[PDB]
Structure formats: structure tokens, C-alpha cells
Amino acid sequence: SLAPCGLVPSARQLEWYNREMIAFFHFGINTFEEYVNEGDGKASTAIFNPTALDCRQWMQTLKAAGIPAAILTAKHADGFCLWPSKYTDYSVKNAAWKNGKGDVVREFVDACEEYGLKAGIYLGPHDRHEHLSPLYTTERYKEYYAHQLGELMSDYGKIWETWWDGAGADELTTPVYRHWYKIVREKQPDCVIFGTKNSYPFADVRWMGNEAGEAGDPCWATTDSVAIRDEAQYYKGLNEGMLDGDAYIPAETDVSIRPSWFYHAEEDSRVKSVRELWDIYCTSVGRNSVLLLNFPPDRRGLIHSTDSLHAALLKQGIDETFSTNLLRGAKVKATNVRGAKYSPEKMLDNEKNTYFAGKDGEVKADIIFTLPKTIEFDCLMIEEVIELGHRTTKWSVEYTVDGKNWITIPEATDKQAIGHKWIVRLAPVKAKQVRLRIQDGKACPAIHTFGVYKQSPVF
Amino acid sequence: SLAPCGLVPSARQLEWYNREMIAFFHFGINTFEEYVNEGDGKASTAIFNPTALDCRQWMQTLKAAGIPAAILTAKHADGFCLWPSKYTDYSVKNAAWKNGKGDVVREFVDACEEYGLKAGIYLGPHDRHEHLSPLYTTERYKEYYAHQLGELMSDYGKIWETWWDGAGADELTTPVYRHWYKIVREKQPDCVIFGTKNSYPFADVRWMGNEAGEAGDPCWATTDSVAIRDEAQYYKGLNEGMLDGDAYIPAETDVSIRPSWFYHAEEDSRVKSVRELWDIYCTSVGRNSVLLLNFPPDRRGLIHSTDSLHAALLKQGIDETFSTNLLRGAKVKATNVRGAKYSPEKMLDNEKNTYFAGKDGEVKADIIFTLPKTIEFDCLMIEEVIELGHRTTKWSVEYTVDGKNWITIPEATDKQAIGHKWIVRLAPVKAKQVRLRIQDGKACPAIHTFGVYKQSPVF
Numbered sequence: 001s002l003a004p005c006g007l008v009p010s011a012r013q014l015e016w017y018n019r020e021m022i023a024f025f026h027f028g029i030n031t032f033e034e035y036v037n038e039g040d041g042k043a044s045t046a047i048f049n050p051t052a053l054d055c056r057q058w059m060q061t062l063k064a065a066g067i068p069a070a071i072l073t074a075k076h077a078d079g080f081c082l083w084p085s086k087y088t089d090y091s092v093k094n095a096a097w098k099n100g101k102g103d104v105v106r107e108f109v110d111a112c113e114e115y116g117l118k119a120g121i122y123l124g125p126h127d128r129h130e131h132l133s134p135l136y137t138t139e140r141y142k143e144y145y146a147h148q149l150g151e152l153m154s155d156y157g158k159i160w161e162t163w164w165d166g167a168g169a170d171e172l173t174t175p176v177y178r179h180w181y182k183i184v185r186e187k188q189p190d191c192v193i194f195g196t197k198n199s200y201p202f203a204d205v206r207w208m209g210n211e212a213g214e215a216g217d218p219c220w221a222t223t224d225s226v227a228i229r230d231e232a233q234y235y236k237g238l239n240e241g242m243l244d245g246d247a248y249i250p251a252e253t254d255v256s257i258r259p260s261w262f263y264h265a266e267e268d269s270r271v272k273s274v275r276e277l278w279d280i281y282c283t284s285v286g287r288n289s290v291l292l293l294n295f296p297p298d299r300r301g302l303i304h305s306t307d308s309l310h311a312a313l314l315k316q317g318i319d320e321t322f323s324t325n326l327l328r329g330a331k332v333k334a335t336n337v338r339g340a341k342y343s344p345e346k347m348l349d350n351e352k353n354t355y356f357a358g359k360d361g362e363v364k365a366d367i368i369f370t371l372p373k374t375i376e377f378d379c380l381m382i383e384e385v386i387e388l389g390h391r392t393t394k395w396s397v398e399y400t401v402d403g404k405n406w407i408t409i410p411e412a413t414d415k416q417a418i419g420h421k422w423i424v425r426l427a428p429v430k431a432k433q434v435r436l437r438i439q440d441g442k443a444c445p446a447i448h449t450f451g452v453y454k455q456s457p458v459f
Numbered sequence: 460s461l462a463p464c465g466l467v468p469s470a471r472q473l474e475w476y477n478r479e480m481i482a483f484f485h486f487g488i489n490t491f492e493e494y495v496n497e498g499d500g501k502a503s504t505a506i507f508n509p510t511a512l513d514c515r516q517w518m519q520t521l522k523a524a525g526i527p528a529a530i531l532t533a534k535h536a537d538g539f540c541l542w543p544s545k546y547t548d549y550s551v552k553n554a555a556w557k558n559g560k561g562d563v564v565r566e567f568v569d570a571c572e573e574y575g576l577k578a579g580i581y582l583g584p585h586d587r588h589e590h591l592s593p594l595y596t597t598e599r600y601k602e603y604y605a606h607q608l609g610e611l612m613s614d615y616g617k618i619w620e621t622w623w624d625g626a627g628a629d630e631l632t633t634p635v636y637r638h639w640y641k642i643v644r645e646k647q648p649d650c651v652i653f654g655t656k657n658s659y660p661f662a663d664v665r666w667m668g669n670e671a672g673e674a675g676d677p678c679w680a681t682t683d684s685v686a687i688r689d690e691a692q693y694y695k696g697l698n699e700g701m702l703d704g705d706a707y708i709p710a711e712t713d714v715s716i717r718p719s720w721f722y723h724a725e726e727d728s729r730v731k732s733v734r735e736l737w738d739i740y741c742t743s744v745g746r747n748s749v750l751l752l753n754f755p756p757d758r759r760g761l762i763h764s765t766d767s768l769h770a771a772l773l774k775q776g777i778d779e780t781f782s783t784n785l786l787r788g789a790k791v792k793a794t795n796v797r798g799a800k801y802s803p804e805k806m807l808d809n810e811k812n813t814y815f816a817g818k819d820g821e822v823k824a825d826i827i828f829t830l831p832k833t834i835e836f837d838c839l840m841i842e843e844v845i846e847l848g849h850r851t852t853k854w855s856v857e858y859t860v861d862g863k864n865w866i867t868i869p870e871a872t873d874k875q876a877i878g879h880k881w882i883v884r885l886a887p888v889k890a891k892q893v894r895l896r897i898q899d900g901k902a903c904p905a906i907h908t909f910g911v912y913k914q915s916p917v918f
């Protein structure tokens with residue numbers, strides 16, 4: 001058996017990585033003002049009044065889109081709570097909605113269970129509403145948040161992610177988050193924590209420093225924990241990470257399907273095209289990250305059908321593209337091969353549990369795929385055995401037609417990270433043989449999957 | 460050149476045939492009652508109130524579905540008008556919608572023009588609302604409808620289809636429709652008229668007897684005009700038509716993508732599968748007809764995304780399926796060939812103006828396609844030069860692998876009609892040669908297109 005190299009993912013981190021995609025639902029009182037994305041905590045609760053709320057409709061959207069998990073904003077910075085908390089009146093308890101008899105968080109988790117989706121909770125650390133109170137102190141707010149966190153972590157089923165937005169959260173110190181952390185971990189042991197700034201010792205996943213949907217190239221699962229803390233001074237450390245990082249905290253890539261995070265009818269026309277989403281997929285999931293994609297429910301409490309459709313067509317395109325590994329049926333020759341179990345053909349067998357590996361101390365490998373009939377492809381994907389840490393740190397891919405000269409693929413020359421998944425899109429080539437070059441590493445390669453593909457017409 | 464055989468289509472009818480698909484939009488006061496598909500004419504106009512009408516979103520759906528034309532229910536039997544007609548109050552003039560200042564028809568035709576789509580109008584002949592007036596007479600109603608007809612044919616741009624539903628229309632006699640017909644024909648020369656019952660002498664296209672999306676096998680473009688008039692006792696005459704029919708009035712197949720024609724949230728889970736739609740396409744467009752598919756807009760004024768997705772996937776499946784004619788590159792030998800101009804190869808050139816033709820007096824033909832590499836297919840399509848009338852009345856398709864034994868394709872033996880397009884799906888076969896057997900007919904064959912194909916995995 002192989003020994004792990006450097007730092008390793010936890011079981012939670014493995015589970016989160018497997019999700020590949022997660023949905024954000026930015027929904028609340030901001031939705032009921034005119035073009036507001038950051039509420040001041042002064043809006044009247046009365047204006048909250050979705051006219052046809054149906055979280056099952058949201059799940060339908062995720063189902064068609066292939067998205068196994070969702071995160072709802074139970075409370076944004078504006079302070080308005082989407083469940084009838086016992087610790088505040090600034091909530092659905094006093095909305096016009098259902099005569100103050102409603103609970104959105106309840107309808108969200110219920111629908112999640114009905115559809116077999118993983119439920120996550122966004123609970124805004126910085127709270128503009130509480131700051132309005134003349135009795136506000138960090139110490140008091142700590143206890144307030146704890147209680148709410150307690151409710152959401154206890155009365156609402158299993159919670160797979162808790163999100164801690166860093167905006168306006170600088171005042172919050174590390175022991176505050178420690179109190180909150182104890183509550184989450186104790187009550188929801190499987191819960192992944194997106195943690196920012198002073199929450200850094202508790203974060204299972206990290207921000208990657210932008211909202212364009214673009215993780216770093218490269219993007220290591222590892223980085224220094226202080227990069228999470230001193231955010232505005234470590235862009236590269238959040239976005240690219242660090243191979244010699246003192247912590248295994250992989251990056252989560254958050255992006256909205258619309259220009260804003262909250263819903264605004266004026267943006268019905270600026271919903272991201274299927275192609276844009278494919279790009280963002282390739283610069284997130286295909287960059288050793290996870291794509292957290294936002295769909296804002298409207299004033300009916302529903303996902304706009306353009307948002308749904310585009311996401312669904314993304315799914316369809318991804319399914320076409322990766323439906324056939326064009327490398328299959330190849331004769332496979334490789335230097336540095338550990339054994340029969342670890343044979344390079346395991347990169348093509350579609351088993352979750354098999355992989356190609358090298359010999360101890362040997363970090364390089366050359367693997368040739370000779371194809372029965374020449375193929376055309378404009379896309380490739382590679383996956384590492386992430387339980388064994390970041391092993392390979394430099395890789396390239398070449399192909400050939402004649403069999404004489406090798407041709408470098410520009411977009412796939414001298415790549416560094418592999419991680420959970422790396423995807424490269426390229427100017428379409430025709431090839432009879434494909435060469436996978438493992439050029440460097442901290443250890444011998446462990447590679448689950450390698451494939452080349454033809455991108456779907458949908459894209 | 461060749462001379463037509465029997466009755467031929469008209470320029471309008473040619474244009475209509477080449478649309479292949481048309482969209483229906485059932486939308487009006489019904490949409491805002493609870494679970495109503497046939498309005499009684501007593502609903503208050505006030506309840507008509509789409510929260511955010513967006514006809515551009517409808518057009519985008521059509522674009523995604525590959526649908527070049529749309530027909531809107533400007534007025535259903537309930538009698539509520541979607542444009543501010545000068546001749547009634549039972550209209551958008553007195554809706555909650557936009558404080559009575561809206562015009563759905565205007566937004567519709569404006570969106571059509573913007574996206575380059577052909578606009579058509581459904582104007583209900585039977586009007587339950589008008590019937591409620593103590594002053595109702597057929598003769599008064601005839602003038603009322605004529606006034607509305609003149610508005611819609613004059614102020615709303617080029618109209619490509621007028622639809623005359625026959626439900627409850629029996630008290631309307633031919634001179635009534637004649638007066639209606641002159642307005643349409645004069646103001647809109649290119650406008651196709653869907654005619655039922657006593658409108659029979661004015662119909663450009665006929666109904667085909669059901670709302671399940673199945674034209675007949677066979678389905679002749681021709682039939683006896685009496686079939687249309689006496690609809691209820693001539694099902695085969697509408698559905699299949701008649702080879703010796705007195706008129707050229709091709710069948711238009713209408714079906715809803717939902718169980719109901721109007722929108723109901725309860726049916727969101729009953730939208731037709733991509734495969735059902737593909738069946739329907741094959742039993743409509745694939746049966747010498749045109750498919751009119753209904754997408755009912757909802758209380759917000761949007762097309763539901765499931766509806767969108769399934770249509771968009773059908774379009775995608777059609778495109779993949781027919782993108783490659785597997786017979787191309789064949790050696791082609793045929794009996795009964797008119798000349799080099801009309802060689803059997805013309806069936807394979809993907810050109811609009813060419814076709815294979817037989818010789819005068821000879822109605823039989825045999826065309827053998829010899830393929831370089833043995834192929835696999837499960838679908839075929841054939842298209843006649845309909846400008847020259849229905850010429851072939853019996854055809855079959857055979858294959859072979861070794862070359863010694865011709866093998867019949869059960870699904871494609873002794874077919875009768877060809878017309879505009881005929882499509883046959885079959886259990887997958889492998890073949891080195893394919894035989895097209897033109898076995899009988901009224902005149903020498905004239906064929907634009909023959910082809911075999913592999914159905915999309917989408918199906």
C-alpha cells in the first residue's frame with residue numbers, strides 16, 4: 001500500500017469534494033426591496049411576503065441540474081431571520097407572509113429531505129440589525145448568535161454545511177468563533193464549515209478570494225491558515241493556495257448565476273449563458289475546487305425559469321461531454337508502474353476505487369495510450385487519489401498522428417496541480433496516440449482517472 | 460420538366476409545411492382561475508393579472524426548441540380579449556394588469572418580430588361571453604367578430620396564421636366565415652387559415668381528428684372538403700385524409716406539452732417526456748403533417764422551465780439524429796431514372812432544389828445504395844417533391860450485409876404516403892447495402908430526400 005504525502009483531507013473534506021457542485025439560495029427581506037443586495041437592517045419585517053413560495057420547485061431545479069446539496073441564507077447581514085427564532089422579532093414571525101406563521105428554513109430542509117439533497121445553512125456573522133440596538137456588544141452578540149446557531153443546528157435535521165461570510169466580520173475574534181464552532185461540531189459532526197478571517201482554525205473549507213467563479217491555476221488544497229485570517233494580504237494564498245501550506249483547507253468557489261446575489265427582475269436578461277457556466281465549471285470543479293452556484297428565489301419565492309433551464313442544460317452538456325472516455329480500448333504502456341493492481345489501465349476502468357500508481361521514490365512517469373482508431377478531442381480530465389495528498393506537481397499531455405513526432409498540447413503543458421479533479425479544454429486535435437507525462441512530484445503518482453473527451457454541442 | 464399529379468399545394472401551404480413545428484400559447488383569463496381550461500365568460504376581467512409578463516422569454520424558448528412560428532390565443536371561448544379592442548369591454552382594458560393599460564397581443568407580436576419568428580392568431584369563433592348578451596344574434600356576432608378580426612389583421616404586423624377552433628362553432632354558417640375569410644385574405648395574403656367545420660371552403664390546413672399528436676398512417680395532404688365540415692363523422696377522412704380527396708388541405712397536428720391546454724401548477728409534474736415528444740414528432744412532422752405544440756404561460760407570464768428543457772432537448776435530439784445521413788458516400792444504382800439532372804444521388808446531396816425523378820408513365824423504381832463501410836441505423840426518413848402532388852403510394856426499404864439475401868425492415872414495408880416528410884423508426888440493423896423500393900403510385904416518383912440515421916441517445 002502507498003503512504004500519504006504531506007497533508008491529507010478529512011472525511012468531511014472528502015465528502016464535500018465529492019459533491020462537486022452546491023447551490024446557494026440568497027433569499028430574504030432584501031428580495032422585497034427595490035434592487036437591494038445589502039440590507040441595512042431597517043426594513044420593516046412586514047414587507048417580507050413571497051406570493052407562491054415552493055422549495056420543492058427549488059429542489060426540482062437542482063435535480064435537473066445535477067446538484068446534490070444546497071445552502072440557504074437563514075439570515076444575511078441585514079439580520080432578518082427566515083425561521084421563527086425565539087431570540088428575535090426581526091424575522092418571519094412578524095412578516096406579512098402567512099400571517100407571521102411561516103418558517104422558510106423548515107420548508108427548505110423538508111424539501112431537501114424529500115429530494116434527498118444535503119441541506120446547508122448560511123448564518124451571517126456580521127449583523128447590521130443587532131448593531132442597531134443601543135445595548136449591542138460583541139459579547140452579547142456572541143450569545144445571541146450561539147442560540148440561533150443552536151436552533152438551526154438542533155431543530156432542522158442534519159446539516160452538511162455552515163457558511164461564515166467574512167464581510168463586516170473583522171470585529172469578531174477567534175474565541176467568538178470557537179464558541180460557535182463547538183456548537184456546530186458537537187451537534188452536527190458531518191457539517192462542513194466554510195470559514196473566513198478570524199474563524200481560520202475552524203474552517204473545513206476556504207474562500208478563494210474572488211466571486212468571478214475563478215479558482216487559481218494552480219489551486220492547491222493546502223495553504224497557510226494565516227492566509228484565511230489576513231485575507232486582503234493573501235490573495236494568491238486563498239486563490240492558488242500553497243503546496244507547502246501548513247493546513248489542508250481546500251477552496252470553495254462561490255458565484256452567482258446573475259450579476260447580483262439577490263433576485264432582481266432587471267437582471268432577468270443577465271442570467272449567465274450555458275457557455276459561461278461551462279467556463280466557470282472548468283475554472284472551479286475543473287481546478288481542484290467546488291462550485292457553489294447561487295440561484296436567487298424571486299418575490300414569489302421561486303427560481304426564475306431562465307436560471308433553471310440554463311443550469312439544466314449545463315448538466316446535459318457535462319453529461320454528453322464526459323459520457324465516453326475516448327481513450328478506452330487503448331493499449332497502454334507505462335514507465336514507473338507499481339504493480340498489476342496499480343496498472344496504468346486503471347486510469348480508464350471507471351472504477352471509483354482503482355488507480356494507477358508509481359514506485360516509491362520515483363516521482364516521474366510516462367504513459368502512452370495507443371488507440372485502435374484515431375480520434376478527435378478538445379477536452380481532457382485527470383483525477384488524483386486525494387486521500388494520498390498532493391503527489392504530482394508537474395504534468396503535460398502530448399499526442400501524435402503519424403507516430404513519428406510528438407506534439408505538445410499548449411493548454412496542457414507544464415500544468416502543476418491535479419488534486420480532486422483537473423479539466424483542460426483545448427483546440428480540437430486528431431490523435432492516434434496520447435502521451436501522459438508526469439514530470440515532477442513530492443511523491444510517486446496516484447491517479448484515479450485520466451481521459452480525453454469531445455465537448456458537447458450544447459457548449 | 461415534370462408535371463404535377465392531381466392536386467398541388469399553394470405557396471402559403473408550402474411555407475406552412477416548411478415550418479415543421481409551430482408553438483401554441485394558451486393564455487388568458489382562464490390562467491387566473493383555479494384549474495379552468497374552458498371559461499364560462501363570467502369571470503371578472505379584474506382577475507387577469509400576470510405579475511411580470513415576458514413574451515421575450517417565450518421567444519427564447521422557441522429559439523431553444525428550434526420553433527420558427529407561434530400562435531397566441533387572442534381570445535378563447537370565454538371571450539376575454541388580450542388586446543384593448545374598441546368593440547368590447549371584456550378585455551385587458553378592464554384587467555388589474557397594468558391598470559387596464561396593457562396589450563398582450565402587442566407584446567407578443569413585438570417579441571415575435573424581435574426574434575424573427577412568425578406570429579399567428581387564434582381568435583375564438585364560439586364566444587360564450589357574447590352569447591350571454593340578451594341582444595345576441597349570429598348576424599350581430601358576425602359583425603362583432605369581423606370588427607375584432609380587422610383590428611388584429613391590421614394593427615399588429617404580418618400575421619402568418621389564423622386559427623378557427625370548431626368547438627361550439629356549429630351555429631356558424633359558411634357565409635359567416637366567408638365574410639371573415641375576405642378580411643383575412645385581403646389584409647394578410649400570406650396568412651394560413653386553420654379551418655374547421657362550416658369554414659371548410661376557406662381552410663388552408665385541416666384538423667386531423669385528435670389532440671394526442673397522431674396524424675394518420677397514411678396521412679394524405681388531400682381529402683374531401685366535406686370531411687372538414689362533417690368533422691364528427693369523418694375521423695379517418697381528417698386523420699388519414701383521402702388519396703382521391705377533392706381538395707388539397709393538409710393536416711395540422713395539435714397537442715399540448717401538458718395534460719391541459721391552459722397552465723396549472725399541478726401539471727408541472729405531468730409535462731411530456733423528451734421521448735413522448737419525439738414519438739409525437741414522429742407521428743406528426745414524421746407523418747406528412749405539421750406539429751402545433753402548446754406551451755401554456757403561467758400566472759407570472761413565463762414559460763415553465765420543464766416545458767423549456769424538454770422542448771430544447773427534443774431539438775437537440777433531432778439535430779444529433781439527423782446531422783449525418785449514413786447513406787452518404789454510397790455507390791448508387793437505380794432503375795427508372797429520368798436523367799442526370801434527376802439522378803438517385805440527388806436524394807443524398809442535402810440540397811434544396813434537387814431530387815430524383817422517374818420517367819413519365821413509370822411509377823415503379825428501385826434504388827440500391829452500396830456502402831463503403833457497413834453501417835448501423837435505427838431510423839429512416841424520406842421526402843417527396845410535394846409541389847408535384849402525391850406521386851408515390853407504396854414504398855418499402857430493405858437491407859443486406861452479405862449481399863445474397865435482401866432483408867425486409869418490418870416497420871418500413873408497404874408504407875403508402877410520403878408527402879412532405881415521412882419518418883420511420885426501427886429496431887437497430889447493420890447493413891452494407893440498402894434498397895429503396897418505390898412499388899406503386901399515380902405518377903413517376905419525385906424524391907428530394909432519402910436517408911438513414913442513428914437516433915440520438917437523448918431519446
Ligand SMILES: O=[N+]([O-])c1ccccc1S[C@@H]1O[C@H](CO)[C@H](O)[C@H](O)[C@H]1O
Binds near residue numbers: 168196207210
Ligand atoms: O466585502 N467585499 O467588498 C467583497 C467584495 C468582493 C468579494 C467579496 C467581498 S467580501 C468576501 O466575500 C467572501 C465570499 O464571497 C467571503 O465571505 C470573504 O470572507 C468576504 O470578505
Ligand SMILES: O=[N+]([O-])c1ccccc1S[C@@H]1O[C@H](CO)[C@H](O)[C@H](O)[C@H]1O
Binds near residue numbers: 655
Ligand atoms: O369538443 N371536444 O370535446 C373535443 C374533444 C377532443 C378534441 C377536440 C374537441 S373540439 C375540436 O378541437 C379541434 C382542435 O383540437 C378543432 O378545433 C375541432 O374543430 C374541434 O371540434
